């Protein structure tokens with residue numbers, strides 16, 4: 001009756017990983033970093049638990065123009081597979097702050113690597129505002145009330161930060177002062 | 178001929194060898210300049226772990242080539 | 254007065270890996286930089302294919318360690334290995350005989366190398382059981398501390 005994916009939880013480590021990626025590539029405020037997210041996307045709730053950075057470059061001025069290293073995705077994910085088979089490739093992330101005209105085309109690229117409709121996680125690394133610096137999206141193709149035409153579009157999913165016991169210990173430790 | 182052996186810690190080591198050298202003896206040639214037992218050395222080149230039995234001619238390692246040293250990682 | 258500074262991702266990666274391996278030991282490499290004579294920064298860590306029991310662990314794939322270090326350079330992590338970490342599920346932090354044989358091989362390539370040991374079992378809310386060590390063979394313990402505004406606001410989003 002209803003879509004399967006209704007909710008998303010993100011591990012703290014994922015958020016800190018996106019932030020470390022953006023910092024270490026010294027991404028200029030106009031620029032953004034892009035990577036992969038891993039986890040479990042079979043239950044209603046999508047669990048984002050790990051991630052890794054991608055080589056990614058784009059034209060500051062135009063949207064259609066970008067490079068995403070196909071070979072790196074394949075290489076790094078197989079590495080991850082050896083270390084942890086539970087964390088499967090479920091989508092991608094970028095540093096935002098918001099959706100960009102190129103994200104639907106970039107998302108189609110990840111459909112090759114995910115067993116399900118990919119999940120796009122934006123992590124607003126500059127953390128402006130109250131409320132989580134995360135927004136989750138899955139692309140769907142909706143039949144516009146034409147009623148035969150369609151319109152490929154990002155569907156928003158609400159987010160929460162959920163930590164395992166180990167991450168909860170680490171975070172409360174880090175938040176010591 | 179002069180080759181290079183970079184480590185994952187940044188320190189780089191330079192060796193002078195000849196293409197008629199077994200991987201077993203190359204690890205011994207590393208223990209002389211830094212003190213690491215050969216049994217604890219894993220040699221990598223072009224994605225391949227060098228096997229102690231073969232020589233440089235089996236891996237086509239020419240002059241000024243760069244090897245990468247990984248260590249045996251053992252914890253208890 | 255020398256201190257090992259462990260970044261947020263490094264601590265969370267090591268804790269998460271320690272608890273997942275239970276009841277086995279786990280290990281991995283530590284990336285960072287030696288800023289000065291009194292300061293070691295561990296910015297990042299990673300785990301290679303390995304095998305462990307309740308009281309041992311060893312790395313299996315050695316290609317993986319080389320490869321991984323090139324992937325990170327490609328994505329902005331230029332830091333190199335400053336040491337290694339493994340877990341003592343349930344029996345505290347200290348260096349065993351095996352760990353010394355491994356640590357000295359590390360200290361041969363960098364006299365400032367570090368060996369970190371975490372106890373996933375004894376680590377609980379309000380008590381993180383971790384320690385950093387080096388040799389001279391006996392060994393000694395280095396003080397551990399943690400470094401940013403960006404990470405801190407981000408962490409406060411949990412709860």
Ligand SMILES: [Zn+2]
Pocket residue numbers: 252253339340341347348349352370
């Ligand atoms: Zn130990």
